[PDB]
Amino acid sequence: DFLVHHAIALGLHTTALILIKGALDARGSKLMPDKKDFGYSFPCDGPGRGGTCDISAWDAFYLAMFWMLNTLG
Amino acid sequence: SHSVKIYDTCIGCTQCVRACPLDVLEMVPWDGCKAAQIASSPRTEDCVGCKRCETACPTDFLSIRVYLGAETTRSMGLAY
Amino acid sequence: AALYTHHQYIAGFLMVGAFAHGAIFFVRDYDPVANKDNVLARMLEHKEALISHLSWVSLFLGFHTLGLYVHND
Amino acid sequence: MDGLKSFLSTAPVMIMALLTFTAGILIEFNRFYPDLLFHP
Amino acid sequence: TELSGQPPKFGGSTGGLLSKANREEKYAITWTSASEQVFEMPTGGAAIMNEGENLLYLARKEQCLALGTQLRTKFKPKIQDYKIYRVYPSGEVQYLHPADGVFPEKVNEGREAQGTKTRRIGQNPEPVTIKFSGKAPYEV
Amino acid sequence: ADDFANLTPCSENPAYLAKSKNFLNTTNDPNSGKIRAERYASALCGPEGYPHLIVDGRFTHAGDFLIPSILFLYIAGWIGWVGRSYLIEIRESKNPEMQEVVINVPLAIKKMLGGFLWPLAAVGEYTSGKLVMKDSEIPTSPR
Amino acid sequence: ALNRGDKVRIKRTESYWYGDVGTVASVEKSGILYPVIVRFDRVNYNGFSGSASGVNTNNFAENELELVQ
Amino acid sequence: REAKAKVSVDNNPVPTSFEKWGKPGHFDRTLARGPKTTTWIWNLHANAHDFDSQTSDLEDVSRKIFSAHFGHLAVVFVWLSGMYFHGAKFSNYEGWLADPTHIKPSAQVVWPIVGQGILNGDVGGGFHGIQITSGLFYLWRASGFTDSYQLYCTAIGGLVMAALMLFAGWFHYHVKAPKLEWFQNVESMMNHHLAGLLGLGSLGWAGHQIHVSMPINKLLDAGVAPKDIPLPHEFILEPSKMAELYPSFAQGLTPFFTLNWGVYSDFLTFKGGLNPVTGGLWLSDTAHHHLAIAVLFIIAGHMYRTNWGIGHSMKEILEAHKGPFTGEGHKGLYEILTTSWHAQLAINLALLGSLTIIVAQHMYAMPPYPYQAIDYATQLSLFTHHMWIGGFLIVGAGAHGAIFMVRDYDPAKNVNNLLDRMLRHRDAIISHLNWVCIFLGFHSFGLYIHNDTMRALGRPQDMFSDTAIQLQPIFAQWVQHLHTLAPGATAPNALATASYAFGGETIAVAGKVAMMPITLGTADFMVHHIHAFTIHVTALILLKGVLYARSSRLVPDKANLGFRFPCDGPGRGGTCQVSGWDHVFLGLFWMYNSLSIVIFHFSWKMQSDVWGTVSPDGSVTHVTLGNFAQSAITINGWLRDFLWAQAANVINSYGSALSAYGIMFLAGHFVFAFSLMFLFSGRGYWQELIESIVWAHNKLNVAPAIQPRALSIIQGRAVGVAHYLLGGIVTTWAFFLARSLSIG
Numbered sequence A: 001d002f003l004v005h006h007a008i009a010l011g012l013h014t015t016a017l018i019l020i021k022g023a024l025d026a027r028g029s030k031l032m033p034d035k036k037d038f039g040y041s042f043p044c045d046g047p048g049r050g051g052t053c054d055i056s057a058w059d060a061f062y063l064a065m066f067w068m069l070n071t072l073g
Numbered sequence B: 001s002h003s004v005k006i007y008d009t010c011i012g013c014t015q016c017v018r019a020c021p022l023d024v025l026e027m028v029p030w031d032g033c034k035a036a037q038i039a040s041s042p043r044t045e046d047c048v049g050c051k052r053c054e055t056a057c058p059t060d061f062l063s064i065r066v067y068l069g070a071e072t073t074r075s076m077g078l079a080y
Numbered sequence C: 001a002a003l004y005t006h007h008q009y010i011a012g013f014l015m016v017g018a019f020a021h022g023a024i025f026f027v028r029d030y031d032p033v034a035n036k037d038n039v040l041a042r043m044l045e046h047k048e049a050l051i052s053h054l055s056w057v058s059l060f061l062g063f064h065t066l067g068l069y070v071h072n073d
Numbered sequence D: 001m002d003g004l005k006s007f008l009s010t011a012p013v014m015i016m017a018l019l020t021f022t023a024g025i026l027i028e029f030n031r032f033y034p035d036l037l038f039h040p
Numbered sequence E: 001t002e003l004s005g006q007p008p009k010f011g012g013s014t015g016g017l018l019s020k021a022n023r024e025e026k027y028a029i030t031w032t033s034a035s036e037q038v039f040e041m042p043t044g045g046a047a048i049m050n051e052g053e054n055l056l057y058l059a060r061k062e063q064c065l066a067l068g069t070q071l072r073t074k075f076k077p078k079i080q081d082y083k084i085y086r087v088y089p090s091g092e093v094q095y096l097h098p099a100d101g102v103f104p105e106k107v108n109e110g111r112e113a114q115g116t117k118t119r120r121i122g123q124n125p126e127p128v129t130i131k132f133s134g135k136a137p138y139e140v
Numbered sequence F: 001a002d003d004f005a006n007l008t009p010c011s012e013n014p015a016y017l018a019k020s021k022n023f024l025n026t027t028n029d030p031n032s033g034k035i036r037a038e039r040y041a042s043a044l045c046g047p048e049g050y051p052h053l054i055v056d057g058r059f060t061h062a063g064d065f066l067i068p069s070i071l072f073l074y075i076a077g078w079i080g081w082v083g084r085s086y087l088i089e090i091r092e093s094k095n096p097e098m099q100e101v102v103i104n105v106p107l108a109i110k111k112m113l114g115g116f117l118w119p120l121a122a123v124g125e126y127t128s129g130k131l132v133m134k135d136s137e138i139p140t141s142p143r
Numbered sequence G: 001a002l003n004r005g006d007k008v009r010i011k012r013t014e015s016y017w018y019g020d021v022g023t024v025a026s027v028e029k030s031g032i033l034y035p036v037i038v039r040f041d042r043v044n045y046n047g048f049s050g051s052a053s054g055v056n057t058n059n060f061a062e063n064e065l066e067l068v069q
Numbered sequence H: 001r002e003a004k005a006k007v008s009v010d011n012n013p014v015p016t017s018f019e020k021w022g023k024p025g026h027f028d029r030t031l032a033r034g035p036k037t038t039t040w041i042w043n044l045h046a047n048a049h050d051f052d053s054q055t056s057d058l059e060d061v062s063r064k065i066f067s068a069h070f071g072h073l074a075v076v077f078v079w080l081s082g083m084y085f086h087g088a089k090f091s092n093y094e095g096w097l098a099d100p101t102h103i104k105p106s107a108q109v110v111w112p113i114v115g116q117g118i119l120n121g122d123v124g125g126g127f128h129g130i131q132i133t134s135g136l137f138y139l140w141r142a143s144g145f146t147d148s149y150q151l152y153c154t155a156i157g158g159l160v161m162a163a164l165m166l167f168a169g170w171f172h173y174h175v176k177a178p179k180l181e182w183f184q185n186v187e188s189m190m191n192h193h194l195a196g197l198l199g200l201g202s203l204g205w206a207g208h209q210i211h212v213s214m215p216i217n218k219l220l221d222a223g224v225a226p227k228d229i230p231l232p233h234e235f236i237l238e239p240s241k242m243a244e245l246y247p248s249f250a251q252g253l254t255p256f257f258t259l260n261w262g263v264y265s266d267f268l269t270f271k272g273g274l275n276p277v278t279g280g281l282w283l284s285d286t287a288h289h290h291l292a293i294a295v296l297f298i299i300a301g302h303m304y305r306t307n308w309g310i311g312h313s314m315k316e317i318l319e320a321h322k323g324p325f326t327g328e329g330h331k332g333l334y335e336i337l338t339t340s341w342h343a344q345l346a347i348n349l350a351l352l353g354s355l356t357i358i359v360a361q362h363m364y365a366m367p368p369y370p371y372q373a374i375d376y377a378t379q380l381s382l383f384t385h386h387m388w389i390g391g392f393l394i395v396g397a398g399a400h401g402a403i404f405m406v407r408d409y410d411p412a413k414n415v416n417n418l419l420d421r422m423l424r425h426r427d428a429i430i431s432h433l434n435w436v437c438i439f440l441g442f443h444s445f446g447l448y449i450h451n452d453t454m455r456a457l458g459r460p461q462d463m464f465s466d467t468a469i470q471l472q473p474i475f476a477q478w479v480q481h482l483h484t485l486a487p488g489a490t491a492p493n494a495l496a497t498a499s500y501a502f503g504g505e506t507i508a509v510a511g512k513v514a515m516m517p518i519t520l521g522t523a524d525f526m527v528h529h530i531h532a533f534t535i536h537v538t539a540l541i542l543l544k545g546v547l548y549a550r551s552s553r554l555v556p557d558k559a560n561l562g563f564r565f566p567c568d569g570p571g572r573g574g575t576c577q578v579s580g581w582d583h584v585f586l587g588l589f590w591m592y593n594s595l596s597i598v599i600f601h602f603s604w605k606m607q608s609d610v611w612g613t614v615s616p617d618g619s620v621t622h623v624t625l626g627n628f629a630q631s632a633i634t635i636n637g638w639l640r641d642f643l644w645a646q647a648a649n650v651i652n653s654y655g656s657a658l659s660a661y662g663i664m665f666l667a668g669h670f671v672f673a674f675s676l677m678f679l680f681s682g683r684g685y686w687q688e689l690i691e692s693i694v695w696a697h698n699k700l701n702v703a704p705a706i707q708p709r710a711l712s713i714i715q716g717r718a719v720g721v722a723h724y725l726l727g728g729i730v731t732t733w734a735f736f737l738a739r740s741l742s743i744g
Ligand code: CLA
Pocket: A010, A014, A017, A018, A063, A064, A066, A067, C054, C055, C056, C058, C059, C060, C061, C062, C063, C066, H670, H673, H674, H675, H676, H677, H678, H680, H681, H689
């Protein structure tokens, strides 16, 4: 039970990290300092500046869904 | 169609026009940089949104920005 | 068993949705001048600390729990 | 020559050398004093 | 008016025009060649451009522009006099490229400035300040 | 007095004794199983026969977690401090990056050997050095 | 007023080096909105995906710089 | 070293030095300037062997390729010598040879430490180790190895050869570097590879089999025991020792030159069946086969014109082949396969992977090495191993076809040839292949779904089974019947069938079955159509990637983007994975899927309707009691009676010599799940997380000068697919090995 409660702690911490990082960078970061101008959900910003796949906060939601399902598992 | 805006941080290196694959951008005269020119987006109805103009931009964060809007045959790049 | 599983899954969905709507608020509704120097603006102002320390706690938990499980195996 | 030493001082060579050295340390420690679950 | 030029020597392919060219729109590239040369077709396979004038119909504008870049970057006497038009099913022809007879890479007088923002990137209005309107930070 | 009533010392647990009578040899030592059965009879065992570890913090079980914790903290502080000071000395070598890829062996060894005093040099740099940096002098992203 | 060699901090918010330090290389004459050429040690993000480094120079204005040495 | 040849080398083009070893990235001008971002590191490994992106000289590239070939041959020699030495001083090859039927082939002893010594299980005769499935002992017995000292000598010879190949690579890249003219001698190279490499190789191996393998094995099967067999060379020193086994030897090599070949019918046989003592192919048959193959290859190695007027010019042959349907035909293909390395690599990878899969299929049903059919673990392991090697080589063939399309394709030299016309109707090709894949998927997997739904609803008579609506593979049954009737009719001199898998006697050696008739029913029909479906989907992905590498209706300038690029932006609706590299990326997954279903079919069918024991009545009791017919028709059958059931050995492997298989089982599962993270996400999120962590390091001045960058999109994909394949293949490796080692 100790080991599995630490697994649950990992799951919660990681899912919340995804969600919080997505919400706090939703207005912008150093790849997209104007990410708020594009909206909550957009495909990306292109391969330029190194590649920008899964940049929006919606992509953070979609990532966090996997870890949430894993935590509930 | 997509919006292609240009800002005052333009240095007029003409790279985004050279990188455009659908002739959306032009080099018009200006007085805000050394090259005495600025980028423009007259033919935005032919923009597909490939972000190449942004990729070829040198300014610290782009001076030219592409915002994907209402999709059409031309923007979706359809040959049918 | 089915009741516990059902309601824990509902709770996971609700939590993910809560954080998604927090990010959506940040994208659409956040006013930096009317909320200047308040709790919200400070949360945004040290977002790197929060994200990095969530990263540390997550790496910590995962590293050590997976290490203990693999040792036991 | 100098280039041979510079190759021997690269990141992968140094990291694998340190990992092998630490592997030997730990393997010998657990060989002579095994099953050390906890300190008395 | 009437587009002139000989079609390139081509045996045919399945990548050419479809029903869009007659239902919706089509495009045309014209160019003069110093000799009978071999070029690559944007729709796949090789073709032979005639010496003199060449007229070629393509389905999309990006295809004509790819052909133009190839003409101007892959041949010993660079072909840069190419022109790209848009043809409609009513037979109407709209000249397109180069817009003002000069390539857009280099500055030329007479051109207006569109999409030019007087402000900086980071000086866009906050979305909350323009919400419940039909505009975005990059539009006001 | 009756603390941890669910657990009993491994010597007093019959399952542990039965299993330890058949513990397997680990190394080439034929008594490795015997010496393991003798060393693990000290700790507390469960109904199954395997020892449980107590991290409650009491110094009766100071070897279960406290001592490995202290040892690892010392060694990991050593590693981190020598790496950090190596990177910082690299910072002032005109070409710091290619010395970060190609490891300066003498400088690296000199930093590593002088690492046994990391917990003192740490507070030395914290009191009035470069350990902590002012927030306004650190590059950040838009909020 | 800034000259060559002036170590300065960038205040452009949207900049990749906002809060970082860069050295002035040259100042273009009047008229230009962003004449102060600042070179940097840390390359930015520019380049196609998978490319090596980035761009280590940009033009700013006087108002967007904080002076150090 | 001319000797009036066409040889042309440069006596000193590259100086020998060690300084460049200290400059990581010397071969790439974009990497020579030193790292600034972490990506610099990764690209250094990505372009390591990308000789085209390092220099535009075809000659220097050919020289680098030649020396790299020599280096790889040295590596394979080192590995082969390691295997031989481990069989020499670390294996029970002699204790096994003394009594194979009661001992397990072991090798690689484990040092007793931290508990791992448990992996050295008892294999027989008191030997403790890890049972090996590579089948090395069977191969060595077929070769005639009697003494471990000879394995040691083979290891020494292999290490000497490795040193030789390494010296040859160094000598031909630094000393005598051959010119570009020398590599373009495709006619000479072909003549030699047919006659010198293949012809002479099989000729010498037939000789070794006649003088070493055949006599020693003839005695070995009769129970003479190894230590009582004379050495292999005592048969060459004493001709009477060869004539006592084969009286045909007593007439000497006089009947050979006089075409009096029938005399040699003592040791050059056409028995066809299997050796009743050991369950392998007759070594007389294999020697006869190597002799015929050698003669064939030598005769073939004379077709092409070199330095004497006689021969065939491949350019004339290719250009002479053109018809009404294909325009100018194969014109320009000579110039392609002479000036492009990637075209050659694609063709050769394709044919070699196909040859490897063919090797697997031909060795599972025609066991060539003695006592290899008895051992089910070795059989399954070799089968799936060659299967995976072939699949990977085929995916690489697609990769290099696309690479040629992007880099070496010249439209000016491909005017109305076969390649031009293929590019001009690629739309028709790919649309029809799309339809064929859909029709197969509906008509293979969909049949399984029908069976699942019908059985679940309590309607067994509505299923596609041998007992309901039958899908009898009539054609394969007819061909099997023809094979079982060939000896004596359509194969007059052949004594027995080519293989008993088509039918005949249920050959069993010791207590187990070696090879019996493999029946084909409704489930076999369904599995074969699943195979066709998956192969078609993989080939569709790869062929579409090749044909559309240069251009498409979406991206008319794709060639200018290169072979390896993530995309061309979110425009045009989205253009991710439009490159040929990404087509290779997807074809990797589909190759994994195809081959996984193939090897699962192999395992279950062998264990169900072939493998098993035989009691002294003729009656055969199979491993899993013939459950293939009634269970391999639904997906629930594969889930329960194949995966759930046969993984019981792997999961309960703890506390035995197979606990490592359970460990690696869990490890492959973990690596698959780990790959999922690289496969489902995007680079931007990770770059933002790295930005936050970089700020955190800036807080304590631990900021590295090499700026941490997230993995590139292409690199993210490569990492994801690599971990996916690794995890899945290791999972099935552990599962198969544990299962086939826990079935007796
Ligand atoms: C079993 C699958 C798996 C694994 C191991 C990971 C691993 C990790 N994820 Mg992840 N994730 C997964 C599935 C997985 N993910 C899936 C399916 C998704 C949906 C796409 C995500 C999406 C996701 C997001 C969005 C995020 C993570 C984060 C993390 C990291 C958090 C640190 C941690 O959890 O503890 C510690 C680490 C581990 C337990 C795994 C590494 C342990 C290994 C075995 C150590 C040994 C290394 C090895 C020796 C190296 C040498 C190998 C050599 C032989 C080649 C971590 C490294 C979060 C993060 O980055 O935190 C900062 C983050 O934000 N994941």
